[PDB]
Structure 1
Amino acid sequence: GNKIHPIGFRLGITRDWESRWYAGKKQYRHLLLEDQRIRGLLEKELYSAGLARVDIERAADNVAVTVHVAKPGVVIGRGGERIRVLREELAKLTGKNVALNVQEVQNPNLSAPLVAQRVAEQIERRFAVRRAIKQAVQRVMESGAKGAKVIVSGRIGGAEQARTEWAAQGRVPLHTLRANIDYGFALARTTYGVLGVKAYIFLGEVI
Structure 2
Amino acid sequence: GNKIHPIGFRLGITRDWESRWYAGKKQYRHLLLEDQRIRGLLEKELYSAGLARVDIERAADNVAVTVHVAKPGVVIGRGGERIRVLREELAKLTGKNVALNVQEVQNPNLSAPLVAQRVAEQIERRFAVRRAIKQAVQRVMESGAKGAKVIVSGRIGGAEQARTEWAAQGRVPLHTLRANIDYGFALARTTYGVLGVKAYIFLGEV
TMscore range, shorter length: over 0.9
Deviations 1:131-187 (Å, cap 9, x if unpaired)?
122000000001110111001000112222100011111100001011110000001
The Cα shift of 1:71 comes to 1.5
SS in 2 for 1:33: helix
Distance 2:16 2:136 in 1: 27
Aligned residues: 206
The Cα shift of 1:60 comes to 0.9
Deviations 1:101-149 (Å, cap 9, x if unpaired)?
1112211101200110001100011111111220000000011101110
SS in 1 for 2:204: coil
The Cα shift of 1:84 comes to 1.2
Q: Note the residue ranges of structure 1 that are not aligned, 5 or more in a row.
A: none
Distance 1:205 1:80 in 2: 39
Distance 2:46 2:180 in 1: 27
Contact 2:55 2:66 in 1 (8 A): yes
Deviations 1:63-119 (Å, cap 9, x if unpaired)?
001101122123210000001110010000111111111112211101200110001
Contact 1:187 1:197 in 2 (8 A): yes
Distance 1:169 1:145 in 2: 10
Distance 1:74 1:89 in 2: 17
The Cα shift of 1:4 comes to 1.3
Contact 2:51 2:68 in 1 (8 A): yes
SS in 2 for 1:17: coil
Q: Which has the higher strand share?
A: 2
Q: Which has the higher helix share?
A: 2
Distance 1:201 1:176 in 2: 14
Deviations 1:12-42 (Å, cap 9, x if unpaired)?
2211100000011121111110110000011
Contact 1:188 1:194 in 2 (8 A): yes
Q: Which has the higher mean CA deviation after the structures are superposed, 70-79 or 82-91?
A: 70-79
Q: CA RMSD in A?
A: 1.1
Contact 2:49 2:70 in 1 (8 A): yes
Query: What is the TM-score normalised by the length of structure 2?
Result: 0.97
Distance 2:133 2:110 in 1: 15
Contact 2:133 2:151 in 1 (8 A): no
SS in 2 for 1:68: strand
Match in the other structure for 1:62: 62
Distance 1:13 1:53 in 2: 19
SS in 2 for 1:204: strand
Distance 1:91 1:75 in 2: 17
Distance 2:18 2:147 in 1: 24
Contact 1:48 1:75 in 2 (8 A): no
Distance 2:121 2:185 in 1: 12
Distance 1:138 1:17 in 2: 29
